């Protein structure tokens, strides 16, 4: 097998078991990792579902490659303890992550400089008796707080709101959209899908700015 | 009135002047009197080709010209370079050929001219005047021991491009003449590289000067005054290039003019992409080649 790790004897197996509008909620914390220059802590708990995750910043790191006019972002999603999302399922989100911050970050302030983003999908409850799609907007919030902690030039507190398998990311207090994500749902529910996302965005950004300006 | 060409063909991987045509591994002759040049290797008599190409016998010189290969750089040629890299006081820049050309630091037109003399602080500003991927007019000076050659801009006429659009072709169809900058009705100008690189732009006064400020030789600016009637006229000359390229046509400046007026059937400029219609206009000119000269 893998000669680099301790994976036990091969013939063992893990243990098996069988059967015998609501509120979302946060707890947002910064400044707790001394390796980084930007850290952010996120608790989330909603109705069957409790979620905690860590966003980590390293920047500006040097680039051994070549010259660029401006900065470059690198984003990692890694499984924590229990929930195991698929590998190719991860990087699609990482693709969707980078597009929004490329309408956020003053890379032109940062020539030949790198951005390292480590996201640790650390622990999630789903006690409910598109499972990754329910965790998208909280990432952007978790990144933004850590990116404020490294103090990097950011245009807006941009945030995403969720309405039932749909993720829409805003700026300008919702007056423009910067990132769009849709799974199955209804048809032409878009206009209501504007709304419930927007107000959570209207909730969340206020929760964020409270976390920093009051500190 | 369409969106896309969707024509279907299912059940197949594919649809399925005399001179010496020789192969590699093949004997030409063993007359020792012949001289042995390009495309030729040998063992003391046995004249052996190395490519798919033609026997060229020049008066005692036998050599093999291939049919397929990259662009061959030669001196004094007027081509277009895309900026690959920056070196010590050197630059790397694609020809399209085998390798990059090189370009000395003082090989370029300085703003203010020669009154601006040398400075070691200029290598602290290599990226100032030039950076990657950019397009320009270049003059082929001389070579190295291999066959890699270098460039320069010994004129105002050579320099960094603007005011238009690039296209590219195989190097074969571009015909040689004593002139390469050409000016076309529509107030516009083709800059045919030899190597297969083609830049269009709006006719400048310096272009007009050819047939009757200096601090703008590294700008990313254009003329701000660019009409759509300029811009849409660019595209009509643009596709007819690829029409002749798809039709395997040697480029004549007049043929382009002949391509342009034959394209006046179609005002819908987006219809200039059709495999048949490009071939039809391609068929037009070859028939029109059988009248004049």
């Amino acid at each position: 097998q893998d000669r680099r790790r301790l994976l036990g004897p091969a013939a063992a197996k893990p243990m098996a078991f069988s059967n015998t509008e609501s509120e979302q909620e946060l707890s947002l914390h910064t400044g707790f990792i001394e390796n980084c220059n930007g850290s952010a802590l996120v608790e989330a708990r909603s109705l069957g579902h409790q979620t905690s995750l860590i966003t980590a910043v390293y920047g500006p790191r040097s680039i051994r490659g070549s010259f660029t006019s401006q900065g470059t972002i690198s984003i990692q999603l890694k499984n924590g303890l229990l929930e195991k999302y698929n590998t190719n399922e991860l990087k699609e989100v990482s693709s969707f992550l980078m597009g929004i911050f490329n309408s956020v970050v003053n890379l032109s302030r940062y020539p030949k400089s790198g951005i390292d983003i480590f996201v640790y999908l650390t622990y999630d409850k789903d006690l409910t008796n598109s499972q990754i799609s329910s965790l998208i907007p909280h990432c952007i919030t978790s990144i933004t707080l850590a990116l404020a902690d490294a103090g990097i030039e950011l245009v807006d507190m941009a945030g995403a709101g969720e309405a039932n398998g749909t993720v829409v990311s805003f700026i300008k207090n919702g007056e423009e959209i910067v990132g769009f994500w849709k799974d199955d749902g209804d048809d032409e529910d878009l206009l209501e899908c504007l709304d419930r996302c927007k107000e959570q965005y209207n909730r969340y950004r206020d929760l964020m700015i409270s976390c920093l300006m009051n500190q | 009135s369409e969106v896309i060409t969707i024509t279907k063909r299912n059940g197949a991987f594919q649809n399925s002047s005399d001179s010496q045509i020789v192969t590699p591994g093949e004997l030409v002759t063993d007359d020792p009197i012949w001289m042995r040049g390009h495309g030729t290797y040998f063992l003391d008599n046995m004249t052996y080709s190395s490519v798919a190409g033609t026997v060229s016998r020049v008066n005692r010189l036998l050599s093999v010209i291939p049919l397929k290969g990259r662009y061959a750089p030669e001196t004094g040629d007027h081509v277009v370079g895309r900026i690959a890299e920056v070196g010590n006081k050197r630059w790397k820049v694609d020809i399209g050929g085998k390798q990059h050309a090189v370009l000395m630091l003082g090989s370029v037109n300085l703003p203010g001219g020669i009154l601006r003399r040398k400075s070691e602080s200029d290598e602290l500003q290599m990226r100032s005047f030039l950076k990657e991927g950019d397009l320009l007019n270049a003059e082929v000076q001389s070579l190295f021991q291999d066959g890699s050659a270098s460039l320069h801009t010994r004129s105002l006429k050579y320099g960094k491009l603007r005011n238009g659009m690039f296209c590219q072709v195989p190097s074969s169809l571009i015909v040689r003449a004593k002139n390469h900058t050409h000016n076309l009705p529509g107030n516009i100008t083709v800059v045919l590289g030899v190597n297969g690189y083609i830049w269009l732009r709006k006719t400048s006064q310096m272009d007009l000067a050819r047939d009757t400020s200096s601090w703008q030789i590294y700008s990313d600016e254009n003329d701000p005054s660019i009409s759509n009637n300029i811009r849409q006229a660019i595209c009509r000359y643009a596709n007819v290039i690829k029409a002749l390229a798809f039709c395997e046509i040697g480029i004549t400046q007049q043929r382009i003019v002949s391509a342009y007026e034959a394209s006046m059937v179609y005002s819908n400029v987006g219809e200039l992409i059709e495999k048949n219609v490009m071939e039809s206009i391609g068929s037009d000119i070859l028939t029109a080649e059988k009248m004049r000269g």
């Binding site: 680099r4 301790l6 036990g8 063992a12 078991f17 015998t20 990792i33 980084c36 980590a56 650390t122 | -």
Partner: protein, 136 residues
């Protein structure tokens, strides 16, 4: 790559864990009347089975040597480990199968898949008088 080795080494050299603590005493799920299931558990004592445990250490904001905190954080996790109740089927459907040779044949043994309970669990037995702690 050193760390997970180095712990495991002195965990062996701690002599914390007799394999008696890994001995699993499974039950059998009696298919009882009118379609109900109760797992007959034997108590206070044909195949045997053994737990094999795993750990994962995540390290955030490394500021120095880590090994002592690698040690000590495990120790409190060790005391919190419940052993979940494992049981086998009453009579599992997954039984002996035969494989034909080029004239001969053999028998695959019956595949009794152990199942841990959704509910019941017992704690872990520890040589508690050998639970160390670390210091550099």
């Amino acid at each position: 790559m050193t760390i997970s080795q180095k712990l495991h080494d002195s965990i062996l050299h701690s002599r914390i864990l007799p394999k008696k603590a890994l001995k699993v005493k499974a039950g059998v799920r009696s298919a009882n009347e009118d379609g109900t299931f109760s797992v007959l558990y034997p108590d206070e004592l044909k195949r045997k089975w053994s737990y094999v445990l795993y750990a994962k250490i995540v390290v955030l904001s490394r500021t120095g040597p880590v090994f002592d905190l690698c040690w000590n954080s495990l120790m409190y996790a060790l005391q919190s480990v419940k052993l979940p109740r494992a049981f086998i089927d009453e009579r599992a459907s997954d039984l002996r199968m035969t494989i034909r040779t080029r004239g001969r044949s053999a028998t695959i043994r019956e595949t009794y898949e152990i199942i841990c309970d959704q509910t019941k669990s017992v704690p872990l037995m520890i040589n508690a008088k050998n639970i160390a702690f670390a210091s550099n």
